[model samples]
Target: SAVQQKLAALEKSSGGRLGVALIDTADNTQVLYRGDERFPMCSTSKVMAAAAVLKQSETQKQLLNQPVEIKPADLVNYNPIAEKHVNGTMTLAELSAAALQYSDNTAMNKLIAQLGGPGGVTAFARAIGDETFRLDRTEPTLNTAIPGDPRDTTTPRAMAQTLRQLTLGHALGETQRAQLVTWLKGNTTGAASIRAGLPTSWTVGDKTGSGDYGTTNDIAVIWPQGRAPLVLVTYFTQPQQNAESRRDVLASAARIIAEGL
Candidate 1:
């Protein structure tokens, strides 16, 4: 298929390892390129946390609007959003928005702790049917390189599966899923990656992850103007000489995929 070929060319030109999964819900057509290979999810793992929190809120009859304290000690120096509002308090929903929209490390860490830490996140993934995705640690760690550690790792296929389930309203209830999609659509980070590759007429709701050792990823739900929605998960791992090279490859790949539609 043209889409598959273009992705292949993008990977070849990227000079880095890529794991991609594109699934068309319209007809259940699918494409997988190195789909099973694991890669650091970075901030993309926040989406899982978001889902877990929402699920717990729904199941336990907890209020999402309940306020939570944000202590100064909990603030991550690397996180712009959290740093700006240290020692303030925000509702659970507010914190989730901060984490998802801005990819705030401190906000995410707070959510991770609320979900009972890394173990809770992993448990949520399995309970929701994504066995290959794992959340093993909090953020704000040394990101100089992609350490061989298994902390916060996932395969493109697994990411795509979870995203697909969410989009289909199978992973969460109707209202919960709608809220999740809204948060994803509100994401303002990583604009140069998947979102940059799309035609203005199309809309994409996505999450992005970036780290050292050439880890850059974008997982998106694409809405073509007149076609059914599709899930596209792309990962670029290993080292790249140019900092922007992986992003460029991702943009080119997204464009190629869009053109095929």
Candidate 2:
């Protein structure tokens, strides 16, 4: 199909590390090339951020609607908040939205800071039977630290496990799971790799991460009409940050995998 051919050309062009896994939630069909390697999940790690929040919400038996006054320091990215409310307060809902919708690193950091630091997120991971994946927050950040640099490490399988729980409404409780799904559904960031082949009108819930050399990742739950939702986890790294090139690669791969569905 056109999809497979396009991706073939992309991999040929990059000649670098790229891995993808597409799983059918309905029949458990699998399409993958190299889905087992350890790759930096970048902002995609925010899915952990979302899970951390959901875990806390369930433990408290409450939803996240409380407000926090956004100190200028709390704002992670200044460019987006230049004109909006400052020193004002927002609910946990708002903060989570900020984290996923904007990939708000600062908001994510603050949330992790409040959730018992890096240990909390890692604990949440273990709480859910995804012990193979490691998430640590310390010193400089709340998300996973750099790998092979005395940091954190996560695997494709671990991410897939988390997504399965979230989709099956087993991650948190019924209410918390629903809330997490809604928050993920609202993720509007377009910089990630999974959005490459999706329709503009289709709904997708995802988080992305990008940084340093050859680091790019997107984990997504895609909802399309007439087909059961699909979970796709993609991790890629290159010496360049060519967003367009990467998008094209992701789109081509998705096109091939999704065409049959």
Candidate 3:
């Protein structure tokens, strides 16, 4: 099969430098070797941050479009852009959707802050039965390399499960869950993951996160006819060299995983 050949090529070239896993929801089949370890989720952490917001909103029964201003107090010292360039005000709906769709680091931090900091988001994940998804901060050394120096953390299984529950409308209220999916479907970054292999018109909502070093992850819901929406999660981390290699690893894994579906 094409997937087997792709995996072989990846292993031969990368020599097991990364970890990946692709689970088929149709029959509960899982193909994974080294994709289990917890790793830095980079901006991908925004998904969980988004989840936190949705959970809070459900409890409050708040509309997603309700406006909130970005005040001076919301600023984090590290990122000059995120700190200085406040958009004045934006709806929770906009920030949540924009953060994931554009991979906006500022938007991500803003959402995290709104969701009660990192602890709040982590708590949301824990409530969903994901023990491995812990919050992580960016390394100072790596932060110096990027503009915002923003950081986030999660694991493959945790991410996958989060999306799974999200698609099933199992979190919070039905209205909030639907709104969350709308934002996720609006996600434009990392289109080559599950979206690559599925029907062009199919509903594939996802978010991709990449950061300094070799950290990259894709959490997604692959929707298809007659199939129980699948959760696809992949992570690559601790690469000794450039970000290019990490992108390559993730892209390859996404193609392989999605192709098999």
Candidate 4:
């Protein structure tokens, strides 16, 4: 109750439409605040895409270290990965690291194409029990879509569920899950979102997404020392606001949830 109340206050203060889901893994307790509403997932969709790539690698007996070339046509005009390293070749693992750690649009788009396109990523998501999640377009293209459009969208609940599944090793094998978690732990994009709100005693493995028209999202698995981890998912859409406002909302909400837990 206190958590929801605090989040309501956060929504009002930040002037954004917010969706939140918190799952306490130790006791199997769960809560939702506007969790079913869909919002653009932005670069966070890279997580789903990464899972697909990992699965494809396994099925084909390919290694993450296998090399792939980056051509000029592969570059997208959005993020740093596209701006730098335009025509170099790197392993799939390297690309994955760049995409997850830096939220690189070029690396993400390359991964999407390697998996046979956006449809392949969508299929992987569906197989993992994501109902509203979609990977219709790759980075840069979908980034320019109307704010909060459903082109590439997911609800807080769905994202929390996906994170929970990963934690439980439901969709991937032990090694694959470990690799995925490693990438998440190395994420470098969200300094001001949920990660900013975490207590000093806790650690988080998270993925963040942002785009035009106030799309900001963070999905995380939080570790509180000896206790089982918690899955925290937060999304915001405020067309009239700046990125800092959305980050503030997420940070406020995360602090409230962390303290309540």
Candidate 5:
């Protein structure tokens, strides 16, 4: 495929391994380039952590409104909003927004704890038929994306499939699913990746995650006008830590694959 060839060139030029998965959910148009291989998930894990919080609210009645008091000890690196109020309370929904939209580390760890820690998010993914997703650590620790390390990792294809189930499939309840979609749409950190690759007319809901060894990821569900939705996931990593992570590689990869339309 021309797309695959172009992606190979892109990968070589970027000096990194790229995992890409593009699924036209409605018509079943799909493409996978090294999609089955493990790649660090980075902050993208917050998307699932946030969804679990929402899904948990479905059975745990009133859970969303339950105010959780923040503690000074709960604060971790890269927490902006979550650091604002030590000992002040925020509801589960507020924390979800903080974690997903702001990618706040403290908010995400709090959500993980509320769901019974990192395992809770992993459980949510497994129950939704995602066998490849896993989270073994929290916050800054999880970002230690050692090349080929299985911890806190997932394949791009599995992630796109899982995101499809959560965002457009039957995995989450009606309101909960919608809430997750809203958070991804409102995400503050993904302007230059998948979202940037897409045309303005297309509605894209996605998450961005980046970390050690030049690892960066973007997962998305796109709604193109007059067409079926597209679920895309990209994970990129350089074996050597040569430079700062570049998100535009993801944007470029997505554009090439999607242009094959």
Candidate 6:
């Protein structure tokens, strides 16, 4: 419980509630804090969408190579990459890259479309034995992190479990898993969060998310020197409306987690 104690202290210092889970798959070492509580999936849902797409590619050989047309109507509030490709075309794999590596809102939507809707991604989660992850809506709206609202939510444990399964477990094929890791490694938005707390020598791949009400999240699979990979997730949320969002605190939190292990 020392890790949990440190987590509580960190939450107090950071001025918000934090839900975190770290699973060292080798020995199943787990540190959980508010592990069952719901937090908005936010952009972190992109990885789930990407996983669903990659799973589909197994049966549908051309799925990854198929081109999807991007339209102005596809643009969401934070769609930098998708916006540039508006009226252009990108393969499903490219869109998946934009979604995972950059958190492009429109790219996420397009990826979801391939699943027939957000619900399909949830079904994929279920198929993977993850019962706590869900996607109920599309971008700019799924971010309504109103206190206790469950839509588009995932528990800290569920997200961490899913990350481990996708990256290191048998839920995804070798090629699919490698592709997912490649995208997560190229992530551009998590430099100030979990990645910042980790030693440069460690191998890390992650995905991040942000939402209303001071919600910020980072989930990763980390390989410490001479050890098995650890899948970690940190979800921070403030009850106060728009209370100062802190993305960097995840670094401090992750350091404590790694040290405890």
TM-score (all chains, Cα) for each model:
0.92, 0.83, 0.80, 0.93, 0.97, 0.97
Worst 10 residues of 4 by lDDT: 239-248
Stretches of model 2 off by over 4 angstroms after superposition: 1-9, 77-85, 138-150, 199-201, 240-245
User: What is every candidate's alpha-carbon RMSD to the true fold?
Assistant: 2.0, 3.5, 4.5, 1.8, 1.2, 1.0
lDDT of 2 by residue, 34-74 (tens): 66667666677667766788778876655477676677765
Return the lDDT, model 5, position 217.
86
The RMSD (Cα, Å) of candidate 3 is: 4.5
Per-residue CA lDDT of model 4 for 1-261, tens digit only, reads 887898898888777788999999888888889989888888878888888888777776666888777878777775565456666677888888888889988889888888888998888888888877888897787664366467888889998998888755568877788888889988888778898998767778889988776878888888888889899999887766344436877888898898896
lDDT of every predicted structure (CA atoms): 0.80, 0.66, 0.64, 0.82, 0.88, 0.90
Error of 4 at 109 (Å): 0.5
Q: Where does candidate 5 have its weakest 10-residue lDDT segment?
A: 237-246
lDDT of 2 at 230: 84
Q: In terms of TM-score, which candidate is strongest?
A: 6
Off by over 4 Å in 1: 60-62, 142-148, 240-245
Poorest stretch of ten by lDDT in candidate 1: 142-151
Cα lDDT over the full model 3: 0.64
Q: Write the per-residue lDDT of candidate 3 for residues 1-261, one digit (tens) a residue.
A: 677577767756864345556656767676764556555676667777777887788766664677767766555433333443476777777777767777666666767667666777778888987776766442222222232233344456556666777666587578877877787788877666546645675677787766555555677776766667767777665444355525566667766766676
Give the lowest summed-lDDT range of ten residues in model 6.
Answer: 240-249
Candidate 5, residue 143: lDDT: 90
Question: What's model 2's overall lDDT?
Answer: 0.66
The digit string of per-residue lDDT tens for model 1 on 118-218 reads 89989988998888998877886623336556667888899998988976557887778888889888889868988888887877888888877777888
Going through the candidates in the order shown, the clash numbers are 0, 8, 0, 0, 0, 0
Model 4 stretches with alpha carbons more than 4 Å out = 82-84, 145-148, 241-245
Name model 5 segments beyond 4 Å from true: none
Q: Is candidate 2 or candidate 3 better by TM-score?
A: 2
